[PDB]
Design a protein around this ligand. Structure first.
Ligand code: GNP
Ligand code: CL
Ligand code: CL
Ligand code: MG
Ligand code: ZN
Ligand code: ZN
Lengths: 134, 168
């Protein structure tokens, strides 16, 4: 009962207990970094189930105890260069190397947005967010 | 892209969070922090097919004997995880096995019994016990470890493979 559920970007969610005095940034910094999400590229909102607007923006360093019981939501800032990968099969005719284990890559997969090439058994080591500054 | 609803259940301190965090950001968290409800989504390539994994890290605590029945319904695969350093979690697998199969109404539920913390020298449960228990449920067995990353892939990979074998 002493917790707050927060909906995270990319249709994710977390529930954290509030050591009072902690800010919203302190309680959610661990849950964002483990998901490949940069806190500097995120905003925390309070979900408004009411009319005319679904959420209102909140300060990151506000007291987390002041929002116990409500449902918060973290979203990416406007037009941040973070998206989801777009993998596809690729056979490397010329000798290429994996971006994860730095071994010989023959039949692997590459992202059509950032160019992340990797062995299939290394696809779990690719970052979860796609950085796109093209 | 095909999504797979995955649910990781187990006892307290078994290693459910350390396994998913190593699967998600290729990292290992040493200091222990209990899970209440954590959802993760990541694209993983399984047998040449790039699919999305909606992993749900659940609470091993018995304080949530109500929300457990909810997410066990909408889940497609289940990771029955236990630590070989604790023999109470090995027998508690039957409780998680029967409670999931109850809200599934099917003896054939896509699960895989995995054994974590294989790097510790304080091994209490050997492979002979888990291999026969895996034969008792008809599910594969994967010996894992969150630190050395021993077969952390093959745990989630074989779980999605059973979901694929279960469908068609
Ligand atoms: N040596 C070793 N330690 C591990 C391994 N996996 C987890 N641990 C450690 O044992 C504990 C497991 O913590 P955690 O993964 O949070 O377990 P949990 O099942 O997630 N806990 P909870 O259910 O309460 O949320 C932590 O101290 C972690 O660092 C492993 O494979 N080897
Ligand atoms: Cl969301
Ligand atoms: Cl889910
Ligand atoms: Mg946990
Ligand atoms: Zn990419
Ligand atoms: Zn590789």
């Amino acid at each position: 009962s002493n917790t707050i559920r927060v909906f995270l970007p990319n249709k994710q969610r977390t529930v954290v207990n509030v050591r009072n005095g902690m800010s919203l940034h302190d309680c959610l910094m661990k849950a964002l970094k483990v998901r490949g999400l940069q806190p500097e590229c995120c905003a925390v909102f309070r979900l408004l189930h009411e009319h005319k607007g679904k959420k209102a923006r909140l300060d990151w360093n506000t007291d987390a105890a002041s929002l116990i019981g409500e449902e918060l939501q973290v979203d990416f800032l406007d037009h941040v260069p973070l998206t989801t990968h777009n993998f596809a099969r690729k056979t490397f005719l010329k000798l290429a190397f994996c971006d994860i284990c730095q071994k010989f890559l023959l039949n692997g997969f590459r992202c059509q947005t950032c160019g992340y090439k990797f062995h299939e058994h290394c696809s779990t080591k690719v970052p979860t967010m796609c950085v796109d500054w093209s | 892209m095909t999504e797979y609803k995955l649910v990781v259940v187990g006892a307290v301190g078994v290693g459910k969070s350390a396994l998913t965090i190593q699967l998600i950001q290729n990292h290992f968290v040493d200091e222990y922090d209990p899970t209440i409800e954590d959802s993760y989504r990541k694209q993983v390539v399984i047998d040449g097919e790039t699919c999305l994994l909606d992993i749900l890290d659940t609470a091993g605590q018995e304080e949530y004997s109500a929300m457990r029945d909810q997410y066990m319904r909408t889940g497609e695969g289940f990771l029955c995880v236990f630590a070989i350093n604790n023999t109470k979690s090995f027998e508690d697998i039957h409780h998680y096995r029967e409670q999931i199969k109850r809200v599934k109404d099917s003896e054939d539920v896509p699960m895989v019994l995995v054994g974590n913390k294989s790097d510790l020298p304080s091994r209490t449960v050997d492979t002979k016990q888990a291999q026969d228990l895996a034969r008792s449920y008809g599910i594969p067995f994967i010996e894992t470890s969150a630190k050395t990353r021993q077969g952390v892939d093959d745990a989630f990979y074989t779980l999605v493979r059973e979901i694929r074998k279960h469908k068609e």
